[PDB]
Structure 1
């Protein structure tokens, strides 16, 4: 047993390792999306910038969980980072919809993690999740919802003009 370990259940340790993988996966999805918009036949530079920033944020989320694992005396175990589900993301609207779906999936995982921490009476872990993850997720989901709504109302994906103008005035 680690000399620092206290009130840290083996199930919580394993769930933290699973969350690390999921955050890295989310980073990869956003990386793929970003460079799709950098294609010469797509060419929406602020969509590209927005998703690259989201990708880098997800990496920060993963690294903080790795730090947490060590803080509590757990041991990090890494797994393959699966490639994203799509190579071609179709449109700005479709990418935003996939991002919304991704963020809700990551949120569900975080909520399950919190439920586990609650069941194991781990208030430090509960606080960690609430303070650093849960509101960030709520804000990210709300922002993506707002973006999807605007793109739909503007006439995307059929209107290339709508995506162009959204790229300039919301993401730029």
Structure 2
């Protein structure tokens, strides 16, 4: 037993390692989307940079779980980071739809971890998820939903001018 460990269930320790892996998986998927939108035959550079920034954020969220694990006296156990589901992402609408699904998958895992922490009467882990993860997820899901609504309004996937305008006006200039 770690000398610091107190009120930290083995099941929560393991679930934190699985959550860590899912954050790294989400990072890697966003890396793939960055590289796709940077292709010369795609060439939507503000969209590419949006996904690159998301990739960096998800890696930071993984590192925060590593630090958390050690603060509680759990032990970080790493597994392979699986490659993303697709090698190419179609267009901005298809990519944003996949991003929405990914963000909801991550949110469901965080909610499931909160349920486990609640079951094991771990208020520190509940607070950590509520204070550091759950609101960020709701905000990022809302942002991507708003983007999808605007891509549909702009006539994606068929309307190339609409896709061009989204890259200029909806995502930050990079």
TM-score by length of 1: 0.99
| Corresponding position: 1:61 with 2:51 | no
Unaligned runs of 5+ in 1: none
Provide the residue aligned with 2:115 in structure 1.
Answer: 115
Name the SS for the 2:66 alignment partner. Answer: helix
Give the aligned length: 172
Is it true that 1:28 corresponds to 2:28 in the alignment?
yes
Match of 1:4 in 2: 4
Q: How far is the alpha carbon of 1:76 from its aligned partner?
A: 0.4
SS at match of 2:4: coil
2:126 match: 126
Moved over 6 A (4+): none
Give yes or no for the alignment of 1:95 onto 2:86: no
Equivalence for 1:161: 161
CA offset at residue 170 of structure 1?
Answer: 1.1
Aligned-pair distance for 1:151? Answer: 0.2
Post-superposition Cα deviations, 1:102-133, rounded to whole Å, max 9, x if no partner, equal 00000000000000000000000000000000
Q: Structure 2 CA distance, aligned partners of 1:107 and 1:88?
A: 24
Q: Any stretches of 5+ residues in structure 2 without a counterpart? A: none
In angstroms, what is the RMSD of aligned CA positions?
0.4
1:131-146, aligned counterparts within 5 Å? 131-146=131-146
Q: Distance in 1 between matches of 2:51 and 2:88?
A: 14
Deviations 1:34-75 (A, max 9, x none): 110000000000010000000000000000000000000000
Query: TM-score w.r.t. structure 2 length?
Result: 0.98
